[PDB]
């Protein structure tokens, strides 16, 4: 069995191995990069996702959103409070502010302290989920707007025709910006290029042992677990890695820099912040190895999760008897 301690692995494609993308996904699957949840892709030298990034200040971040934390330091939640549209080139002002701005800093161990340590006391705000995409038309390798799609994969493993459709989200942050704790829908894949700025800290649960960290987050949040009971679906729930240690999780942790790619394997747990003003663009995605996993993806009928047009074909067609209720969430 390769990889077996689920350490997180880092390949160094080549422009040729570039190519093909489902074959290189492939290929680090045959050296047990999933078991970890997480890998990091370094592109090769010759690539270049686009020619200069200056020109993408009049973006328009319509719902920028401030998160909002409340618990102790090392397990909290946090909500995110809508705010006044802004532009991209406001958005970075405001990033780099007095305010908000990443404190002065060691290394990235420093930083990682002081985030676990001063977090919750602040409220950043996070450009997220903006549909749209920074790559150039013509960048043909590891194009994010160009993969195949979840869709036609269902249909070419399954042979089911479905409507739905899957495109990237950018992403803008800042200083302290958090992604809580979550596997992708439908335990999906997803893929999430640092197109610039500062770095990306992740965190992930080895998929082989999701179920230990659902069982800890129970415990830690036993009203939202009371609530639902799939309720890391909501993307509220921050552990640190101090916590994980002190119970036992097995996780690891990666900074992403910009130019760099990082893949989240399915039912790999993952959560994270950002350094400091930062873009970053991401999609879901499938292979044939992820069907297993969406049939026996876990499902938010709460009504709290809240998600996209295109999952209800996966849940219809993969989890036929989960169907009804899950939509009754939806609606
Ligand atoms: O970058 C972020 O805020 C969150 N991204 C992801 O959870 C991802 O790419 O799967
Ligand atoms: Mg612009
Ligand atoms: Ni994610
Ligand atoms: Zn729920």
Known sequence: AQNPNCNIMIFHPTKEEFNDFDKYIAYMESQGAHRAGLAKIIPPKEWKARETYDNISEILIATPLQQVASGRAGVFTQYHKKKKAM?????????????YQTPPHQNFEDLERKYWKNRIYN????????????????????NLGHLGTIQDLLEKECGVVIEGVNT??????????????????????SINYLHLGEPKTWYVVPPE??????????????????????????????????????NGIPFNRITQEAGEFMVTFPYGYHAGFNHGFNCAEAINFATPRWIDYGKMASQCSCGEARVTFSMDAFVRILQPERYDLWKRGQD
């Open 87 to 99: 532009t991209v080139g406001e958005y970075r002002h405001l990033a780099n502010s007095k305010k």
């Open 123 to 142: 409220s950043p705000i996070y450009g997220a989920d903006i549909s749209g995409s920074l790559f150039d038309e013509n960048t043909k390798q590891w």
């Open 168 to 189: 990237p989200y950018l992403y803008f942050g800042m200083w302290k910006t958090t992604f809580a704790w979550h596997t992708e829908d439908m335990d999906l894949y």
């Open 209 to 246: 042992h999701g179920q230990r960290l659902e069982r800890l987050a129970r415990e830690l949040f036993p009203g939202s677990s009371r609530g639902c009971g799939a309720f890391l679906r909501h993307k509220v729930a921050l552990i640190s890695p101090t916590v994980l240690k002190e």
